[PDB]
Design a protein around this ligand. Structure first.
Ligand SMILES: O=C(O)CCC(=O)C(=O)O
Ligand SMILES: [Mn+2]
Lengths: 13, 209
């Protein structure tokens, strides 16, 4: 549920 | 529990695209739907439906509207992409997104095939967002290559996107994002839709004879 905002990847699960 | 589409769009896709111009959502549809889409794509390939995508590009492609028999799950993927764009509610840049292409189902058939560095829409043809879904179970660029390398303008570092199973990718289609498909050494599949800005598209900078 965590977005590292300097990156552009997030898992939806 | 997968994040709901509305929340995924408003709380991640929109801010990520406006900050970086590239946005990856992993585990977009889950294993069952992803494998179903893979089966549909492999069926299209196996029955000879692809043609040359072309020196510049070594992919084989076919265009899918979404309602064709045997492409039901691809149609579900396309409607899910559409839902996400709708939920973005005009917050992607200043674009007014009102149309899109059919789905381009593409295969790089190993053997070092790729796509040289290019910009998707360099001539103002209306396409503002590129949306790609990858369906390669257990893909590992260490073995099979096939990385999509994006070279965002104004940044010194490049962005490497592995064509991972169940991965959805957005990026601005204009000159901000030159990119290449690095040589692929296994069968690499992906499905692309491009979304149109209504005004740019209506300017008809490209006439197709
Ligand atoms: O498959 C990919 O990662 C990108 C393909 C691409 O650049 C294209 O078809 O324009
Ligand atoms: Mn491209």
């Amino acid at each position: 549920x965590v977005w590292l905002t300097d990156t552009w990847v997030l898992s939806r699960t | 529990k997968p994040l709901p589409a509305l929340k995924l769009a408003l709380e991640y896709i929109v801010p990520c695209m406006n900050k970086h111009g590239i946005c990856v959502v992993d585990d977009f549809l889950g294993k069952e739907t992803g494998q179903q889409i893979g089966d549909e794509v492999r069926a299209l390939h196996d029955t000879g439906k692809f043609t040359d995508g072309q020196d510049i590009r070594g992919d084989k492609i076919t265009w899918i509207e979404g309602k064709e028999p045997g492409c039901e799950t691809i149609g579900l993927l396309m409607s899910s992409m559409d839902d996400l764009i709708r939920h973005c509610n005009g917050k992607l840049g200043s674009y007014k997104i009102n149309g899109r292409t059919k789905a381009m189902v593409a295969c790089y058939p190993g053997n070092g095939t790729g796509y040289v560095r290019h910009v998707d829409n360099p001539n103002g043809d209306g396409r503002c967002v590129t949306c790609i879904y990858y369906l390669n179970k257990d893909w590992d660029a260490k073995v099979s290559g096939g990385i999509l390398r994006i070279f965002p303008e104004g940044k010194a570092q490049f962005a490497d996107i592995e064509p991972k199973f169940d991965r959805l990718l957005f990026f601005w289609s204009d000159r901000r994002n030159p990119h290449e498909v690095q040589p692929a050494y296994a069968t690499r599949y992906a499905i692309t839709v491009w979304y149109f800005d209504a005004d740019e598209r209506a300017r008809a900078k490209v006439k197709y004879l």
